[PDB]
């Protein structure tokens, strides 16, 4: 409308800040505290607060006065007139009963910060529930406004169908050819486009909202997008029940899911349940396990990556009656997703969808997978689209968070990823998946005591092929992300003096160190990010340079736990080293 409730207190108001990126309602007290304490001096009501005299055009509430019934410049004001902005209040409708809040100072920060220091993202998650939304809107609003800052790309030459030659206009910084970046082609809108560099090279791979055939000399612009208005909270209000509501158990489970009826039932005695699942503990199993235990129920599976949502579709394909399954692909289809399920049949008993592609519907169970990789925006969008009797958050605050491409200075603790990991970390999880089915007992006991407080167990026994060395080596920055050849050279001698390890997989905290490892040892390489989901049978973690990013325990965990039988780790930090229950080697004895 244009009369609403203060986004800080709940008071009624007709005023909103006209230079904050999202124009939020502010009451007469909070608007005062906002404008005196911040560069924001433009106040909007039904009519903007500007000077009425012709051609004046000053819009600084600290300079506008009320004369008669029109607003006035200091130079233009009539004889008697009072300021719009004095006494601690801004001139609005409900001037009597605007209470205000001490939390106005948290607003002023959220409304003014550039989203670069990690201190701001922690506030965005510890604040009041209404400000949790404002932070989330403005965060996504500035992120889409930064798109127009990155440079544009022209097509120099076509190296093949379908691979291209990036050419990036200098004079403005150049965005990463990444999934987090969606370009549109061109004076005709050719479609949506996503990019990926082919084997660490100067050319780029290519998937799109197909199928236009590109002409050399085209353009790719990171198009800024529109940002929703958040109304549903990040987490719906919690309800405890005396009996399984809305859902109807079955008798009985097949032999496979019997171990999870205990937990499947819990998911029915509360409005929302939170499930932690370290790698290999089979969370996709648990998630489809619900729809088997409550076969009458409509369940909607959702997550962030099309990869995660496809991971659920697959586990569902072999356990569920594909007749009433549907994959919800948006109108703009850029990634090739699942194919065996029907498409866009918004009525089927089983729905699979990206959060962004969620349709407005309802469910008896809503399953949100990879919850750590969410943003509080993502949550509020889930609760707005899906009215649901139950919600089962499934994720792991020890694995990866969502990439926050604006954050440069700072470290975000896992307790402040979502409103949901904040719960999992302080209160603990409701369900915990404690049996690891993927890893040798050596590496699971190291994580189980590093990040899981020894709640995590092992099924595989020890493997022996778990090794450990404190080789510092020197680091060199040809590329900004670091490089350390002196310890890769150790790997070469290791692998050359070793047998099956040739089929190992290289995992380093740094995007460059992998690339050179492609030169010096030519193994299959995967970033710790590009390894969640996949599991490998021999891995080598070559950390580097003692940066924070390198000592990041969470990312450490996802890398290590890719292993099925064997692992070694050349370590650049003496402290983390002795936490690995792996057999140590030395430079003089790496036999
Ligand atoms: Zn403002
Ligand atoms: Zn207020
Ligand atoms: Zn004026």
Author numbering: 0 to 185, 192 to 596
Q: What text appears in the publication on this structure?
A:
Previous biochemical characterizations have shown that CoV nsp13 exhibits multiple enzymatic activities, which include hydrolysis of NTPs and dNTPs, unwinding of DNA and RNA duplexes with 5’-3’ directionality and the RNA 5’-triphosphatase activity. Our analyses demonstrate that while the domain organization of MERS-CoV nsp13 and EAV nsp10 is conserved, the structures of the individual domains of nsp13 are closely related to their eukaryotic equivalents in Upf1 helicase.
Intriguingly, incubation with a 5’-triphosphate-15T DNA (ppp-15T) greatly improved diffracting power of nsp13 crystals. There are two nsp13 in the asymmetric unit (ASU) with three zinc ions bound to each N-terminal Cys/His rich domain. The CH domain of MERS-CoV nsp13 (residues 1–112) is a compact domain with three zinc-binding motifs stabilizing the fold. The MERS-CoV nsp13 CH domain is tightly attached to the Stalk domain. The nucleotide-binding pocket of MERS-CoV nsp13 is located between RecA1 and RecA2 domains. Sulfate, crystallization condition precipitant, was found bound to the P-loop mimicking binding of the NTP’s phosphate moiety. Residues Gln404, Arg443 and Arg567 from helicase motifs III, IV and VI form hydrogen bonds with the sulfate suggesting their involvement in NTP hydrolysis.
